[PDB]
Symmetry: D2
Subunit: 33 residues, 4 copies
């Protein structure tokens, strides 16, 4: 299975941007299986 | 400022998002 | 709405940003 | 040299987010040469 990694992000706005991207990529993951 | 953490699935995805993240940090630093 | 264009240098970078872009579109569509 | 590609982006906020990312990546390009 996938290994998980943690990224340190500077700034709330940047965090929210990268979090939204990550959440979207994970939704794509869910449709693949 | 306290920094945030984001947990990412997959090495390639992590490396991509890390590259983006660090490039954004560089852009801030180069502006001054 | 009129959509925007962004010009990107490099196939790998383009594919990465396109994947992100389309995943965001999917997230919108799945919310309703 | 690099080939350029155009991406169609839906929504101004998303455009600004991806544009900022792209601009940052290109700045990194400039420091490599």
């Amino acid at each position: 299975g996938s290994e998980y990694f943690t990224l340190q992000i500077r700034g709330r706005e940047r965090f929210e941007m990268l979090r939204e991207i990550n959440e979207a990529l994970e939704l794509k993951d869910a449709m693949a299986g």
